[PDB]
């Protein structure tokens, strides 16, 4: 259960880097930057699934990490 | 924990095995089914780094996992050029 906290920490740090990419797109005023984010979202989903499988992170924590970014990603397209 | 370091290397090689199985099916016999493999590789790489950072998997164990698949994917890319 020491592993659980460290895992949760790394995962959130990793989601934060992607979130920053989304937020910087929103805080400013293309073309298919959607392709880039989809790959980033896929990469983090795989980290999340990997951690959920090993019981390092709870299923709902993983779901909350993904939801937080997906909510923000929705506001991006739109245009 | 010995059981957590072992299960993580196991889950990672299992994930690697699944992607390698996809590559070998391609080799044994379209621009979409190359980006798909690139995305798959990116995802596996993310899991590897994640596990390496947490000290669950050794850095060279992660590098050997990636190399095994990169070798096979290079074969496939070379094969693509000829078909």
Curated annotation (Swiss-Prot), chain A:
InterPro entries: UPF0358 (IPR009983), UPF0358_sf (IPR036270). Pfam families: DUF1507. It comes from the Bacteria. Homodimer. Belongs to the UPF0358 family. This is UPF0358 protein MW0995.
């Amino acid at each position: 259960a020491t592993m659980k906290n460290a895992a949760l920490k790394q995962l959130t740090k990793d989601a934060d880097e992607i979130l920053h990419l989304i937020k910087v797109q929103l805080d400013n005023l293309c073309p298919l930057y959607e392709e880039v984010l989809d790959t980033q979202m896929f990469g983090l989903q795989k980290e999340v699934d990997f951690a959920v499988k090993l019981g390092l992170v709870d299923r709902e924590d993983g779901k909350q990490i993904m939801l937080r970014l997906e909510k923000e990603l929705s506001k991006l397209h739109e245009a």
